[PDB]
Design a protein around this ligand. Structure first.
Ligand SMILES: [Mg+2]
Ligand SMILES: [Mg+2]
Ligand SMILES: [Mg+2]
Ligand SMILES: [Mg+2]
Ligand SMILES: [Mg+2]
Ligand SMILES: [Mg+2]
Ligand SMILES: [Mg+2]
Ligand SMILES: [Mg+2]
Ligand SMILES: [Mg+2]
Ligand SMILES: [Mg+2]
Ligand SMILES: [Zn+2]
Lengths: 142, 47, 118, 221, 38, 168
RNA sequence: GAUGUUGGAUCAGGACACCCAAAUGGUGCAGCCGCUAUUAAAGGUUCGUUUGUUCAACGAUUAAAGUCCUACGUGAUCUGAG
RNA sequence: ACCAUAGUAGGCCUAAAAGCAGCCAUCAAUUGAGAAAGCGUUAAAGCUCAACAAAUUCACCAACAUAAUCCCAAAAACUAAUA
């Protein structure tokens, strides 16, 4: 009956918003998903909140595919900042190297969306670079 | 007001084809006019 | 043959004949179609009546006009007729009237495509 | 299908105070002495404010007319709220109203004097630009919401740009050189033929019969 | 219906038809968009 | 008497109305109308960057593809199409799409003519580099309504039964 | 060298910019009431208390107790409270 | 007509703010799809527009209720007119 995007933190999944308001509307059992989503996600101790796709079926049961963490967060950690710049491109938030984009790209290469795209590491790198440019995070290439 | 008006000179400068049209001779102007009165002097100014 | 009058344009629908009985609320207005339905003679009669000069002689010459809805005329009036007048309007033919000679003789203007269904 | 190069604005500069200014109901130095009403200042073609300055767009007046305060109110609120303040700016091509208009109370017999001052108005001649809108927008936007303010003015009015204006003017003289009938209003009125000058006004020589009273007819050659 | 001076389609689903020598706006999605030119 | 300027539009003295009706604009009248004249002169189009890019890329397309198959483009959900592209990735087989407008007149020049009737419909060009036919047919066997009309292999135009043969 | 002027009485002719009756569109129309819009002038459109009063208030009802014009209809038909 | 996946509910705010309350940015996958022009939702979810692909092309500058005795020549596409 519906498809639910949610970007959810590693060790944190709880029977309340956004999880309650979104999945609970479809009539989905929250606790099952808390314990299961955590079963997979608690095991990421590197502290990286992951966008995750929850398909809900007409009988109100559900399945979930866990994706790699958002690029915004990978750049937040790679540049070591707190939050993105208030004004992007007017103000620079943090710095990353030619290496950082390579890493963040090779990590996110396996996304449900990037899996079906053959395009090489250069293109995924350009993607990470755009997602950086919106965050106010500059690239430095040596 | 109403007035005696005027006619600006350009009116009276004939084009080349007006000779061909009214059958006037371009070289020599003609000596006498035959003037007939077609319309009334009523409803017209005194002058 | 009065009943078979033709009216040019849309006149059948929008020409009105008005009459008044003189009694308050005695004002009638009839559409040419309805008037022609009730009285087959009426239309040509009011046509002619309005075209004579307006003097008294109108009434008299109005008396010498004889109108018949179809072609049925008493032997009396048939027997005393002198002359046949020419039709003012030329009545156009329909499609079925044309001799096959004439239809075959007329050019087929455009070339129709075969794959088009007609 | 087919791509075509998109028109770009590299030279378009957005000035400060981009919105229309507020015009004052009464002049700051109020006229003390009631003036005769010249119909003549609404009459015929316009001289001032015929040409663009900074902007690409304008509202062109296709008749003469009297603009009073309530109109300014409309054009102002409307054109301000309708436009993108980043990409667009507007300008008054018309002064704030300087001409006193007089009334007498109701139930007044004729005579006794001239009445008292009720009003203030700006005279506007046919062929003048009321509002000038510059910006990096295409004429389609401005034309979209300008047509409202035009439609709401006293005189008939149009929404135009430089290209539009020049096109319609070149066409306007094309008609006068394409004219197939030997007789134009100019030729007759100037040659006083058929003593026509008896029915015509003295201003008729200049208007060439295209303007009549307050109204303007664009199709008159 | 409404008798109007100027018809204008209010949504994507208004179709504009000439009947009885008038212009009507008919709309199946919403009836309140019905108009009739005078 | 009415003032020189008024709003009620001001009826004109009759002699002036006649003056008006005489001086109206009369438009130039053609001997023969332009559209009913013969065809206009020729406004020929010219190659853009896109047209040169497509001619050159399509020219390279017949070079690199050893098996060029024409598979009718059929509407599948983004799911089916992406899964399809991933399987084609798994055998390394490629798929490419082109505009019919620029693909058509290129093949109407010299070599590849026999493909012309196949390109009037909706087409999808299956690019096969060092291919095996069995594997290309593997996928078109899974989904029934996604037909293969064949085309060019090593300069020879070949059809469905032919591919059934080259596979075996 | 006079076109006698308010309101009633009597008798009403007409308009439709419908108050009722008659067909219908839309609704923030479930139904009952409604609120709006379109088409329709053959017929209707009350009786009282106070004011000279038309207007207005108020009592009681009706399917409704229309808005107007006709020399603010109508005094060689009537009434003069004004 | 036909059709609609991608990082990514871009940052920032915010109860939430996911194109679509406002500020900033306008980037980068695909061959092709705006960090979005409509509606829509509490926010989502969902409908269409723009992009290919398939074709064919012809246009666009639209209009405006009524009065009081009873409508107000009759009619009319055409035998030739500087009458
Ligand atoms: Mg106006
Ligand atoms: Mg007398
Ligand atoms: Mg009556
Ligand atoms: Mg009515
Ligand atoms: Mg009645
Ligand atoms: Mg009276
Ligand atoms: Mg009386
Ligand atoms: Mg009397
Ligand atoms: Mg979504
Ligand atoms: Mg792109
Ligand atoms: Zn609609």
């Amino acid at each position: 009956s519906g498809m639910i995007r949610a970007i959810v933190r590693a060790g944190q999944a709880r029977p309340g918003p956004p999880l309650g308001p979104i999945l609970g509307q479809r009539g989905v059992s929250i606790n099952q998903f808390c314990k299961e989503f955590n079963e997979k996600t608690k095991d990421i101790k590197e502290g990286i909140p992951l966008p995750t796709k929850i398909f809900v079926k007409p009988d109100r049961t559900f399945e979930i595919k866990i994706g790699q963490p958002t690029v915004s967060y990978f750049l937040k950690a790679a540049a070591g900042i707190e939050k993105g710049a208030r004004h992007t491109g007017k103000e620079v938030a943090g710095l990353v190297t030619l290496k950082h984009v390579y890493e963040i790209a090779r990590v996110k290469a396996q996304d449900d969306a990037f899996a079906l795209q053959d395009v090489p590491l250069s293109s995924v790198v350009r993607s990470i670079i755009g997602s950086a440019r919106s965050l106010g995070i500059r690239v430095v290439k040596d | 007001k109403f007035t005696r008006s005027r006619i600006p000179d350009k009116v009276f400068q004939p084009s080349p084809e007006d000779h061909e049209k009214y059958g006037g001779d371009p070289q020599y102007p003609h000596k006498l006019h035959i003037v007939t009165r077609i319309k009334s002097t009523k409803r017209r100014p005194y002058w | 043959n009065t009943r078979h009058i033709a009216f040019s344009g849309n006149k059948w629908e929008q020409k009105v004949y008005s009459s008044h009985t003189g009694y308050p609320g005695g004002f009638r207005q009839v559409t040419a179609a309805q008037l022609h339905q009730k009285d087959p003679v009426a239309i040509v009669k009011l046509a002619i009546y309005g075209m004579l000069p307006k003097n008294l002689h109108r009434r008299t010459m109005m008396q010498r006009l004889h109108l018949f809805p179809d072609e049925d005329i008493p032997e009396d009036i048939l027997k005393n007729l002198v002359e046949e007048l020419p039709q003012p309007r030329k009545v156009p033919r329909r499609l079925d009237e044309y001799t096959q000679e004439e239809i075959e003789a007329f050019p087929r203007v455009w070339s129709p495509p075969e794959d088009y269904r007609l | 299908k087919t791509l075509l190069p998109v028109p770009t604005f590299e030279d378009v500069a957005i000035p400060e105070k981009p919105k229309l200014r507020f015009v004052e109901r009464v002049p700051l130095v109020p006229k003390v002495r009631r003036e005769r009403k010249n119909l003549s200042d609404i009459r015929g073609p316009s001289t001032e404010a015929t040409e663009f300055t900074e902007g690409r767009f304008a509202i062109l007046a296709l008749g003469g007319g009297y603009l009073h305060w309530g109109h300014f109110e409309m054009m102002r609120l409307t054109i301000n709220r309708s436009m993108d303040p980043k990409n667009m700016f507007a300008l008054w091509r018309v002064p704030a109203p300087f001409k006193p208009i007089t009334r007498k109370g109701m139930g007044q017999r004729m005579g006794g004097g001239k009445g008292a001052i009720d009003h203030y108005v700006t005279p506007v001649k046919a062929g003048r630009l009321i509002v000038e809108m510059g910006g990096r927008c295409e004429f389609k936007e401005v034309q979209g919401f300008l047509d409202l303010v035009a439609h709401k003015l006293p005189f008939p009015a149009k929404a135009v740009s430089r290209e539009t204006l020049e096109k319609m003017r070149k066409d306007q003289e094309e008609r006068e050189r394409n004219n197939q009938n030997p007789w134009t209003f100019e030729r007759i009125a100037t040659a006083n033929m058929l003593g026509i000058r008896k029915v015509l006004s003295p201003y008729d020589l200049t208007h060439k019969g295209r303007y009549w009273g307050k109204f303007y007819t664009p199709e008159r050659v | 219906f409404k008798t109007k001076g100027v018809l204008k389609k209010r949504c994507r689903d208004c179709y504009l038809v000439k009947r009885r020598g008038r212009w009507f706006i008919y709309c199946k999605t919403n009836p309140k968009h019905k108009q009739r030119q005078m | 008497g009415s003032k020189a300027v008024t709003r009620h539009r001001r009826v004109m003295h009759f002699e002036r109305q006649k003056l008006m009706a005489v001086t109206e604009y009369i438009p130039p009248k053609p001997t023969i109308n332009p559209r009913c004249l013969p065809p206009p002169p020729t406004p020929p189009q010219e190659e853009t960057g896109l047209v040169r890019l497509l001619r050159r890329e399509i020219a390279a397309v017949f070079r690199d593809n050893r098996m060029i198959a024409v598979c009718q483009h059929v509407a599948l959900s983004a799911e089916d199409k992406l899964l399809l592209r991933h399987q084609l990735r798994k055998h390394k087989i490629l798929m490419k799409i082109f505009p019919n407008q620029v693909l058509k007149p290129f093949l109407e020049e010299s070599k590849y003519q026999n493909l012309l009737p196949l390109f009037v419909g909706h087409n999808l060009l299956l690019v096969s580099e060092e291919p095996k036919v069995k594997e290309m047919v593997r996928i078109l066997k899974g989904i029934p309504f996604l037909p293969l009309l064949g085309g060019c292999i090593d300069d020879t135009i070949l059809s469905r039964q032919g591919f059934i043969n080259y596979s075996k």
